[PDB]
């Protein structure tokens, strides 16, 4: 397999439609040994991850909790065994309060809400790298999930701003990770119909926002020279595994686009 013998931490599983569930599944099909991290609903996450090809230890991780971050490396070492280190880390964590996305005017998002969204979606990429680089092997790889924020778009609003901050954070994380012989990169995915995105398209954050995201999804598939299937996270999961492998060894502080090539076409 592509990831034979590799020990990889995967964060971000919440439902069977989480991009991280598909990253974890593909990594296990490719021979990786996983450690999973989950936020808040651990009973649910364990029941979800019981469907993965192989059993994997699940550790609690709230990226806003300094105690969870400070104990993380020790908890991972206990799970993978003393003397063993991680070869890979997957950050698949994103959050923005409802005031920062959808029909709520861009100017009406309170800073406490924007700040919480940037903490979870951008700053935590650095918090995770800080916690785990001391237990990572040379040749290792840290991968985060991105949504191309180079241009503004309707409805995504402050989540796009958080992704711009994440892209910048990734370039700095690469400088630090390089000292350990570790790569840091993001995968910029096309839109995926997770449970939350299906709810948003269905109008959970207002009708106009849902209508705008549905048009954006259609336009994405139209622009993509190879098409874009929003119901299929497998091409995104494969791309993350490519970055976790030894096959992109000179790429760091960078962004790989798993978007059907849509960002390279105007119409």
């Amino acid at each position: 397999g592509l990831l034979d013998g590799k020990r990889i931490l995967v964060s971000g599983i919440i439902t069977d439609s989480s991009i991280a569930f598909h990253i974890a599944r593909v990594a296990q099909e490719q021979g990786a040994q996983l450690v999973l991290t989950g936020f808040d609903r651990l009973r649910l996450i364990q029941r979800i991850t019981d469907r993965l090809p192989a059993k994997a230890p699940l550790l609690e991780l709230d990226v806003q909790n300094e105690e969870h971050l400070a104990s993380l490396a020790g908890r991972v070492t206990e799970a993978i065994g003393a003397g063993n280190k991680l070869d890979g880390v997957v950050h698949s964590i994103g959050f923005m309060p409802q005031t920062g996305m959808g029909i709520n005017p861009f100017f009406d998002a309170p800073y406490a809400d924007v700040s919480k969204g940037i903490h979870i979606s951008a700053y935590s990429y650095a918090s995770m790298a800080k916690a785990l680089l001391p237990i990572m092997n040379p040749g290792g790889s840290i991968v985060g999930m991105d949504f191309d924020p180079s241009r503004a778009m309707p409805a995504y609003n402050w989540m796009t701003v958080a992704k711009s901050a994440l892209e910048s954070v990734n370039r700095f994380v690469a400088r630090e990770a390089g000292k350990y012989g570790v790569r840091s990169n993001l995968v910029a995915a096309g839109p995926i119909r997770t449970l939350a995105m299906s709810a948003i398209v269905g109008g959970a954050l207002g009708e106009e926002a849902g209508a705008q995201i549905q048009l954006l999804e259609e336009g994405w598939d139209q622009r993509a020279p190879i098409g874009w299937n929003m119901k299929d996270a497998t091409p995104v999961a494969k791309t993350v595994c490519a970055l976790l492998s030894d096959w992109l060894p000179a790429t760091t502080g960078d962004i790989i686009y798993a978007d059907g090539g849509a960002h390279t076409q105007l119409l």
Copy 2:
């Protein structure tokens, strides 16, 4: 003059080396009528602005203070006279706690500090546009100050991340400003020897950081096809005035580089 008859708000003056002092001076030499905003040290700011070519009303504005923002439009209207609106707005506000810049490791900046820096340096660009767009004329212009964060660099650290967030915020502010017939853009300046930057180069944030910024300044002038004079904010001030004028009427959500062309050259 380039800005004859225009009513322009200019924030960010703290010393006679502030980029905003030079923006204000050039705008007044070009016939603009100014309203100034100042943070915390109003007695100092008034004494500084007494050196400007023309007298201008000074209003207090702490961008973290919601009361200051909510009363801002009314305070500006009182200063410029009922029935008059602003033609231009200059955001020349930037801050990052010492833990987020210099020799302090990138991973050691606490989130409360990063969050305060992003609030002042990025979110406030939207807070200012929210407060002032209701009192801006069609054909108007909002300009913010940027430092090219497309690539990571030593010492600037979390200030670079805040600039990446600002660039993203500017693209969204342009969408909102467009409804008022108003443009929103940033000027990405080359490094300027303000009092704070001179202190930083002098080692105020650690020796290695000072050494790295001095090398970055030298490299900037070397790469710039027309050179770069860090002791001269006038070319930056002129660029801001170009954006405040009627001469870039189809440019919005964008970035104009006043950096001697250094970002267009590798060596």
Copy 3:
């Protein structure tokens, strides 16, 4: 006026809908003294330019003709008077054979045709700078016309490739121009309904291509936060004059977008 006392060469006038006709008109309204260059149909160009606010000498210039380029500086000096130099140069020249644009498959453009298009549209920006920099004043400005080629698009095909080459050429021209104290930049315009573009939208290069360009024009205005009027070259002409002025003195090897801000928005 914005360009009072400036001596500016303007190439590219062919009809009253040429972007260069509007650049020339605005520059003259702003006090510039012009020298015009025209290709092949000089009687037509003289009759067109008789409509400009002021009379201006017209010189023949085929950018593929080495003799025209070698004699150009001497012919301009004769027109503006010995001892006088140019302050500005406008390159508003673009060409691509019909095999390289429209419904003709991208793979069916013969290299002789692509090469002629790149010679006229990209290489000539350097040929013009070579010919005219020896007769340009310090503080001078060279401006070329661009159409954002960062992403592929239907119908524009090899003209987009020629614009990518032009953007690269502009960065090198800036290095050379800098030695003379001269700036080099491009204005990336939104789509303009010139006589040729109206014919193309009308199906002159095939129906599907015309349909695609009409959809691209509509999408441009929709994405533009301040809108985009394809029938109005005046905002583009104003932007060129901004770059020819003393108000963007630290910008070189760069691209200014006069496109209503459309390139900064995805939808």
Copy 4:
């Protein structure tokens, strides 16, 4: 292996230091069955390729020769067997006459020389895709070699312009390739000490140019968070194989940077 069962065409081998020699070696170590194409010195290329892990048929291909291109698909089919198609294509072809690189002034490169360089280095990426897409399998991959031309640099001169044209061509090739279920991408490599580059650094194109390229190589390794070894093409070859594999299935019209992450850092 990563490329087990895949039939891949590899162009561009001239010496044992050619990036394509290392692409071919890695692809064979990874189970690919190769067809090689060589220009002009076929006896030399055969002797070089005798050192590859496995024997591979060698076909003549001058990309400026229309007869070679028109017969290419038939010659490849004859080599791989009737009923078999290619899964991958590697374009590792680049050329620029000496007048277009080095100390020769940028303005002194005759257009016939620039045109030949753009034909071989950029247009041929489309010529190759045209010839080979009719004999490529769905899920297939076309990869070309790039050198980041986003910013101008000393000495590389018109070769950089040819790479800007190549990047644009790649975006259009992706549109065409997509109709066949085929991806098109470029690998932007850091500087590699091929025989020609060693000669150039040694002063073959002038002393100043050699000095500038040596400084650029040093700066590249300094900026790279994981370092950059110019004497090692293996990380570049691995990246090309990653794109030829099934592990980046949603990436097209794009650029993957195998440069040690140097393009993501300013200093």
